[PDB]
Amino acid sequence: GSSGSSGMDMKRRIHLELRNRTPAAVRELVLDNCKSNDGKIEGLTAEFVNLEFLSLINVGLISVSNLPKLPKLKKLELSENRIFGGLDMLAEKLPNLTHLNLSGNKLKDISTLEPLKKLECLKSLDLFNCEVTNLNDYRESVFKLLPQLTYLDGYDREDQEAPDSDAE
């Protein structure tokens, strides 16, 4: 056996976290830098019924469609990926999602964030280095779209930075 790397597959990186417990025993799961099946998820399963945190950063993903239902997942990190929209699949899979980090994505329009209106629980969002952040008054154009949202790019609805002791 050997440690995970930027050449390891997502199903194989999921196996490296499952070496010690069942997927139903996992609260916090990290799958960063692993390889996807051409921008679709390969190994993730609905047995993660107790998962509250998921990280899939710099895996280079393009589509959220292969996500399982995760009824406890409050926090998802999908940064440094190739995703360009389709976030209505997050609204059905993750019905009480509070934190959604989408930095470095191919998000180009406020209309890519439109299906996040469904998630009445969504409290924090990140869009650092996204094309949608080049728009005129973009930060207000996200908050007017998603009136339930409290944080955008680590700052709040009042344009003040998040606390170090909380914001989790």
UniProtKB/Swiss-Prot annotation:
Superkingdom, natural source: Eukaryota
Keywords, sorted A to Z: Acetylation, Chaperone, Cytoplasm, Host-virus interaction, Leucine-rich repeat, Nucleus, Phosphoprotein, Repeat
LRR repeat boundaries on the chain: 23-47, 50-71, 72-91, 96-117
Residues recorded as bearing N6-acetyllysine in the entry: K93
Keyword Acetylation in record: yes
GO cellular component: cytoplasm; extracellular exosome; nucleoplasm; nucleus
Tissue expression per record: Expressed in heart, lung, pancreas, prostate and in spleen, thymus and placenta.
Every LRRCT domain range: 130-168
Post-translational modification: Some glutamate residues are glycylated by TTLL8. This modification occurs exclusively on glutamate residues and results in a glycine chain on the gamma-carboxyl group. Directly cleaved by caspase-3/CASP3.
GO molecular function: histone binding; RNA polymerase binding
Modified residues (Phosphoserine): S165
One annotated GO biological process: inner ear development
Record's subunit section: Interacts with histones H3 and H4. Interacts with KLF5; this interaction induces promoter region-specific histone incorporation and inhibition of histone acetylation by ANP32B. (Microbial infection) Interacts with Sendai virus protein M.
Domain notes: Histone binding is mediated by the concave surface of the LRR region.
Task performed by this protein: Multifunctional protein that is involved in the regulation of many processes including cell proliferation, apoptosis, cell cycle progression or transcription. Regulates the proliferation of neuronal stem cells, differentiation of leukemic cells and progression from G1 to S phase of the cell cycle. As negative regulator of caspase-3-dependent apoptosis, may act as an antagonist of ANP32A in regulating tissue homeostasis. Exhibits histone chaperone properties, able to recruit histones to certain promoters, thus regulating the transcription of specific genes. (Microbial infection) Plays an essential role in influenza A and B viral genome replication. Also plays a role in foamy virus mRNA export from the nucleus to the cytoplasm.
Family: Belongs to the ANP32 family.
Protein name (record): Acidic leucine-rich nuclear phosphoprotein 32 family member B
Gene giving rise to this polypeptide: ANP32B
